[PDB]
RNA sequence: ACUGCAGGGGAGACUGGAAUUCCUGGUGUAGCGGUGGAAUGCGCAGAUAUCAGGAGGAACACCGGUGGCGAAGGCGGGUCUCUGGGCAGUAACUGACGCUGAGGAGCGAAAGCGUGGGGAGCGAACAGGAUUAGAUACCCUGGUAGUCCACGCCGUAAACGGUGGGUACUAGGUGUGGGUUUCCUUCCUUGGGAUCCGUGCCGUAGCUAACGCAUUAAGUACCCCGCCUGGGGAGUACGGCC
């Protein structure tokens, strides 16, 4: 069990209501393997600094998982294959 | 590699008296755990030459301790090999 | 027959030549008269005199299409980089903003071998 | 003279883009160590906070 | 994966063979084997229409499933990896969860015991079949079909793989293994991953008789024939052929694709 | 062994932006490129330029330094996984287990070589142009191997600090990188003093043919290994091993 902080940049054509239950089917992959989820903060719309795949807006979501190494390497795999996800950035918060 | 709650089970099985971390039995039993763990990092990753050199420094330090325990008391050398392995 | 009041002048100034093209802000070329179009041939094209005639020839040929105000985007390590901008002011144009869009690689592709002259 | 060594417990994070509007130039380039007074350890922490903020589109690579 | 013999005979001095390490169950499934017989390059008229075929070891046909249409939502289970004498790839017997046996072309990395999904809601793993609308851009795919429902036709030899490049309106730009860029329909289906046994091109068949086992048959050059037999025939010593190089039927070397064929609206760029 | 701390040490997988080139369209018209000066070349069949989209490869601007890390070779775009070494403090533990090391074994820039990939740019061989008495060169336009990747081989470099490894001692002055700790300690100054390990600069005794070295010795000493014995012939012949 290691801490992580996943930042996902979602496509801005999605609405701000279905942003939370769309990520639940990905964060249920963690809970089937023993890891748990702490803080699913959603920042909302924010202007990007450069254009990512013909989009100038993005939705910022911070995941803050705390799971095994093999499930987080599975979580960003399914996040990359989803079409509503532009970027994915997985970083550790421990030392 | 070899965290603090992982080297205690080696020192209980092989150490002499409940705090003995520096005896020839205690040091060899830790190095054999490090050598046998570093070889799985060298079955995957055949080209990690900067880590295979570290394996040769743990073999050469282990073989000097095996030579030391086979000089001062040959009875301790017999029971230490049979519990770990040689040749 | 194209008519546009606001434009964008691009200047490329190398060690051999200068080229002054004038576009609209959408990026479509109106007039482009360079230092070989104004009559020069060889090493004379790199002189600062050949840059203040290339900028005059592109300016009057752009004012016929209605260009009254440009933006300047110079690039290149040339010596005709400052005299071309002052040549646009003495042709009836307004310069507005002068930018710098010289390409700067982030140590990408390999440069050629250095000259042993 | 370093800010992060005097004022303690201020974590340099790549999320905190308000902290990273300074320590970059007007053209979006990382400032030198001898102009911000940082030490060696925190200049390395500023630079990984800036290089990571560029990959998540919180700071521009180049600007004008 | 490629094993080399030792030179105990003149005919094995540089030979090699596949190691057959990925193969389990050396016998095929009985309810999926159909009979074959070699034609010998002979057509319905009994005449040779393709030279240099003939001979060869006796074979049997394995019913490969290139459709993969009627099992959407039903998982599978890779039971075995077998040999197949009709294609250079390897085959994989699938057990579906309702009892049906099927073969597929085995991808690179589809060991015994994996689970194979199919349909529009499948995962992007090697072995799973999806339409091109659901496969994301950039994925290496194989067993691609040209028309919807028409069965897989592209990229199905050993090591073959197609890179999917984009999806614009109702078409998908593919990069076929030749380098050709072609625009097929997005409702065509395709299996994710590169075809396995991708190391059999380096096999050195050792001797002359070993290509007689595989059905090939010798090839006479045209510069040693007579002029009644080949345009390159004749000569008093030996020649280069007295003319520009042609077929035995006199056709000069050049482009043989029909220049106004009906599929030029789909091809984007020719091979290099 | 325990607790801390710094780092481009290595390996794998995924991945980010600027730029070069090409492709497909938009606008536009006669030049562009190049040099000391030109020419070969590209272009007028729509080039260079300017805008938009797409394909691909390779190297990672700023941070970056006088700096870090590694046994040397060498090492930097980001992230995750696995992994080697080092330093300081505590003095818990073993009780001379140390140093060096003929033969030997491993690692070992670049070029090269084998099989298969990839090939943007650069570029031996190559070709044309110019220069010239000539120009098999310098300079210019092109351009193949190779440079890149995977798995093997080669085992050489001004592989250099032209300085083998370990230890003990012998004035200091002054920068910088990693620790721990005492005094005005909350006068905050992240200044001063002490000590341990790196890394530079200047300097005394001492050494040196001189230049210079000088607590990181080329000083004063002891233990072990390699190597030299006038310059060519020559690191060549023959023999042997790879
Ligand atoms: Mg830090
Ligand atoms: Mg008949
Ligand atoms: Mg034939
Ligand atoms: Mg004959
Ligand atoms: Mg006949
Ligand atoms: Mg004839
Ligand atoms: Mg003949
Ligand atoms: Mg003859
Ligand atoms: Mg590292
Ligand atoms: Mg780009
Ligand atoms: Mg190209
Ligand atoms: Mg064009
Ligand atoms: Mg262009
Ligand atoms: Mg890296
Ligand atoms: Mg004692
Ligand atoms: Mg030694
Ligand atoms: Mg090389
Ligand atoms: Mg050769
Ligand atoms: Mg090669
Ligand atoms: Mg090759
Ligand atoms: Mg020549
Ligand atoms: Mg050249
Ligand atoms: Mg590799
Ligand atoms: Mg080697
Ligand atoms: Mg030598
Ligand atoms: Mg060197
Ligand atoms: Mg030497
Ligand atoms: Mg010494
Ligand atoms: Mg030592
Ligand atoms: Mg010192
Ligand atoms: Mg000195
Ligand atoms: Mg001396
Ligand atoms: Mg002699
Ligand atoms: Mg020799
Ligand atoms: Mg010889
Ligand atoms: Zn600091």
Curated annotation (Swiss-Prot), chain A:
A GO cellular component annotation in the UniProt record: peptidoglycan-based cell wall
BP term (GO), one: translation
Keywords attached to this entry: Ribonucleoprotein, Ribosomal protein, RNA-binding, rRNA-binding
Coiled coil stretches, renumbered: none
Gene3D superfamilies the UniProt entry points to: 3.30.70.60
Entry's Gene Ontology molecular function annotations: small ribosomal subunit rRNA binding; structural constituent of ribosome
NCBIfam families reported for this sequence: S6
Family of the protein in this entry: Belongs to the bacterial ribosomal protein bS6 family.
UniProt cross-references to PANTHER family, sorted A to Z: MITOCHONDRIAL 28S RIBOSOMAL PROTEIN S6 (PTHR21011), SMALL RIBOSOMAL SUBUNIT PROTEIN BS6M (PTHR21011:SF1)
Annotated function: Binds together with bS18 to 16S ribosomal RNA.
Name of protein: Small ribosomal subunit protein bS6
Species: Mycobacterium tuberculosis (strain ATCC 25618 / H37Rv)
Swiss-Prot record, chain C:
Span list, region Disordered: 96-117
Gene responsible for this protein: rpsK
Residues of the full protein shown: 23 to 139 of 139
Keywords of the record: Ribonucleoprotein, Ribosomal protein, RNA-binding, rRNA-binding
Protein name: Small ribosomal subunit protein uS11
Gene Ontology biological-process annotations: translation
Subunit structure: Part of the 30S ribosomal subunit. Interacts with proteins S7 and S18. Binds to IF-3.
Organism: Mycobacterium tuberculosis (strain ATCC 25618 / H37Rv)
Protein family membership: Belongs to the universal ribosomal protein uS11 family.
GO MF term list: rRNA binding; structural constituent of ribosome
Its job: Located on the platform of the 30S subunit, it bridges several disparate RNA helices of the 16S rRNA. Forms part of the Shine-Dalgarno cleft in the 70S ribosome.
Cellular component GO terms, alphabetical: cytosolic small ribosomal subunit; plasma membrane
Swiss-Prot record, chain D:
Swiss-Prot/TrEMBL keywords: Ribonucleoprotein, Ribosomal protein, RNA-binding, rRNA-binding
Keyword Ribonucleoprotein: yes
Residue intervals passing through the bilayer: none
Superkingdom assignment: Bacteria
GO BP terms: translation
Keyword rRNA-binding on entry: yes
GO CC terms, sorted: cytosolic small ribosomal subunit
GO-annotated molecular function: small ribosomal subunit rRNA binding; structural constituent of ribosome
Similarity remark: Belongs to the bacterial ribosomal protein bS18 family.
Subunit annotation: Part of the 30S ribosomal subunit. Forms a tight heterodimer with protein bS6.
Function: Binds as a heterodimer with protein bS6 to the central domain of the 16S rRNA, where it helps stabilize the platform of the 30S subunit.
Name listed for the protein in its UniProt record: Small ribosomal subunit protein bS18A
Organism for this UniProt entry: Mycobacterium tuberculosis (strain ATCC 25618 / H37Rv)
Gene encoding the protein: rpsR1
Swiss-Prot record, chain E:
UniProt GO molecular function: RNA binding; rRNA binding; structural constituent of ribosome; transferase activity
InterPro entries on file: NA-bd_OB-fold, Rib_uL2_dom2, Ribosomal_uL2, Ribosomal_uL2_bac/org-type, Ribosomal_uL2_C, Ribosomal_uL2_CS, Ribosomal_uL2_dom3, Ribosomal_uL2_RNA-bd_dom
Pfam families: Ribosomal_L2, Ribosomal_L2_C
This protein's GO CC annotations: large ribosomal subunit; plasma membrane
One GO term of the biological process aspect: cytoplasmic translation
Keyword Transport: no
Function in brief: One of the primary rRNA binding proteins. Required for association of the 30S and 50S subunits to form the 70S ribosome, for tRNA binding and peptide bond formation. It has been suggested to have peptidyltransferase activity; this is somewhat controversial. Makes several contacts with the 16S rRNA in the 70S ribosome.
The protein, known as: Large ribosomal subunit protein uL2
């Amino acid at each position: 069990m290691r801490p992580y902080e996943i930042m996902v940049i979602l496509d801005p054509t999605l609405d701000e209501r279905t942003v939370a239950p769309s990520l639940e089917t990905f964060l249920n992959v963690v809970r089937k393997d023993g890891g748990k989820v702490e803080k699913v903060d959603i920042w909302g719309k924010r202007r990007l600094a450069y254009e990512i795949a013909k989009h100038a807006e993005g939705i910022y979501v911070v995941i803050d998982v705390k799971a095994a190494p093999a499930t987080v390497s599975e979580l960003d795999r399914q996040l990359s294959l989803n079409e509503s996800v532009l970027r994915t950035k997985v970083m550790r918060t421990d030392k | 590699a070899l965290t603090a709650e992982q080297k205690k089970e080696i020192l209980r099985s092989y150490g002499l008296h409940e705090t003995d971390t520096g005896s020839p039995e205690a040091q060899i039993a830790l190095l054999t755990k490090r050598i046998a763990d570093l070889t799985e990092h060298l079955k995957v990753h055949k080209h990690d030459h900067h880590s295979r050199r570290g394996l040769l420094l743990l073999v050469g330090r282990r073989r000097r301790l095996i030579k030391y325990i086979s000089q001062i008391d040959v009875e301790r050398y017999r029971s230490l090999i049979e519990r770990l392995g040689l040749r | 027959k194209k008519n546009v009041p606001h434009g964008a002048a691009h200047i490329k100034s190398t060690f051999n030549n200068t080229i002054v093209t004038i576009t609209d802000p959408q990026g479509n070329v109106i007039a482009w008269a360079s230092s070989g179009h104004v009559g020069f041939k060889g090493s004379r094209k790199s002189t600062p005199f050949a840059a203040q005639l290339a900028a005059e020839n592109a300016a009057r040929k752009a004012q016929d299409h209605g260009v009254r105000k440009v933006d300047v985007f110079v690039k290149g390590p040339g010596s005709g980089r400052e005299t071309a901008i002052r040549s646009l002011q003495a042709a009836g144009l307004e310069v507005g903003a002068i930018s710098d869009v010289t390409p700067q690689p982030h140590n990408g592709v390999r440069p050629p071998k250095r000259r042993r002259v | 003279k370093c800010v992060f060594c005097a004022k303690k417990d201020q974590a340099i994070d790549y999320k905190d883009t308000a902290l990273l509007r300074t320590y970059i130039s007007e053209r979006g380039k990382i400032r030198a160590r001898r102009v911000t007074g940082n030490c060696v350890q925190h200049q390395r922490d500023i630079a990984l906070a800036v290089k990571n903020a560029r990959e998540v589109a919180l700071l521009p690579f180049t600007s004008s | 994966a490629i094993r080399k013999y030792k030179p105990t005979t003149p005919g094995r001095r540089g030979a090699s063979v596949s190691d057959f390490a990925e193969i389990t169950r050396s016998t095929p499934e009985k309810s999926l084997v159909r009979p074959l017989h070699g034609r010998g390059g002979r057509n319905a008229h009994g005449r040779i229409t393709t030279r240099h075929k003939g001979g060869g070891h006796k074979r049997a046909y394995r019913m490969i499933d290139f459709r993969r249409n009627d099992k959407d939502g039903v998982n599978a289970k890779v039971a075995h990896i077998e040999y197949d004498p009709n294609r250079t790839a390897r085959i994989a017997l699938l057990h579906y969860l309702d009892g049906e046996k099927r073969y597929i072309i085995a991808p690179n990395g589809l060991s015994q015991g994996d689970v194979v999904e199919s349909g529009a809601n499948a995962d992007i793993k090697p072995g799973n079949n999806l339409p091109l609308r659901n496969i994301p851009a950039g994925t290496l795919i194989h067993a691609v079909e040209l028309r919807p429902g028409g069965g897989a036709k592209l990229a199905r030899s050993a090591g073959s793989s197609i890179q999917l490049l984009g999806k614009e309106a109702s078409y998908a730009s593919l990069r076929m293994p030749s380098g050709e860029i072609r625009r097929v329909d997005v409702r065509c289906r395709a299996t994710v991953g590169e075809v396995g046994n991708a190391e059999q091109a380096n096999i050195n068949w050792g001797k002359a008789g070993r290509m007689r086992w595989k059905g090939k048959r010798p090839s006479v050059r045209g510069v040693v024939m007579n002029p009644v037999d080949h345009p390159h025939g004749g000569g008093e010593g030996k020649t280069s052929g007295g003319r520009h190089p042609v077929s035995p039927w006199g056709k000069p070397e050049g482009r043989t694709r029909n220049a106004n064929k009906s599929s030029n609206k789909f091809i984007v760029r020719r091979r290099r």
